[PDB]
């Protein structure tokens, strides 16, 4: 997260922290995600495409720090890792960048809401809010494009949805932003998601409800003039989602 503020899990209690264990025993952070029902976390397919064995993954909920423990956090295994069949990584962008993880604790439970863990509602199919609406993003991603390290504390910031027409402008992204994606950026280009915020939530208030409107997918640089963050347009994937969530 470029700019924005350090925060704690309580202000984003749907936020999931996804890690991978390597051959040694060493565990490193992979991507963000979002709790959309007690047993289900939603993220981005590109997070997993290189190492698709579900066994290697761990999901934390209730977690406000990257490499240390938070009071109230809960650790989960991944019982099903569902990548999107039409996923693809182009030369600049990703397509159908959406993934689902069914989480199970070693003791067989799905997540239990607490002060630090809550679900985030999905939108209605094809229902997205107005362009210029202010939304929230969250993650453990870099605080600057050029950084080598990641912040230890969770951050969040606010960005505004951008029109497709604006988005498809050549000095923006031109052709590469499709209707299954959303753009969002800072009006002065000072705040953004960055490397390591991938898979994370874009949350917007729709009707009166806080809703998961996007999933962090790609952007050129971070907080870079005329290059918005790009997100997977969740409202377009309710059939894909509901098919797998009904088990």
């Amino acid at each position: 997260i470029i700019g924005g503020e350090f925060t704690t899990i309580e202000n984003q209690p749907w936020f999931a922290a996804i890690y991978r264990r390597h051959r040694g025993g060493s565990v490193t952070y992979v991507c963000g995600g979002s709790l959309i029902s007690p047993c289900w976390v939603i993220s981005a397919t590109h997070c997993f495409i290189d190492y698709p064995k579900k066994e290697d993954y761990i999901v934390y909920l209730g977690r406000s720090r990257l490499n240390s423990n938070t009071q109230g956090e809960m650790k989960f295994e991944v019982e099903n890792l569902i990548l999107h069949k039409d996923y693809s990584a182009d030369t600049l962008a990703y397509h159908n960048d959406i993934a689902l993880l069914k989480i199970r604790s070693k003791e067989g439970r799905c997540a239990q809401p607490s002060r630090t863990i809550q679900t985030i509602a999905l939108p209605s199919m094809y229902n997205d809010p107005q362009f210029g609406t202010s939304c929230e993003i969250t993650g453990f991603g870099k605080e600057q494009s050029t950084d080598y390290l990641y912040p230890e504390q969770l951050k969040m910031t606010v960005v505004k949805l951008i029109s497709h027409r604006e988005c498809q402008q050549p000095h923006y992204y031109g052709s590469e932003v499709t209707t299954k994606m959303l753009c969002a950026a800072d009006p002065q280009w000072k705040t953004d998601s960055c490397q390591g915020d991938s898979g994370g939530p874009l949350v917007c208030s729709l009707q009166g409800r806080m809703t998961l409107t996007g999933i962090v997918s790609w952007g050129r640089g971070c907080a870079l003039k005329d290059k918005p963050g790009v997100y997977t347009r969740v409202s377009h994937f309710l059939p894909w989602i509901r098919s797998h969530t009904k088990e």
């Binding site: 990703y94 490397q195 790609w218 050129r220």
Partner: peptide
């Protein structure tokens, strides 16, 4: 790895 990925792995 697309040129504009925001993935840790890229």
């Amino acid at each position: 790895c697309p040129a504009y990925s925001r993935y840790i792995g890229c």
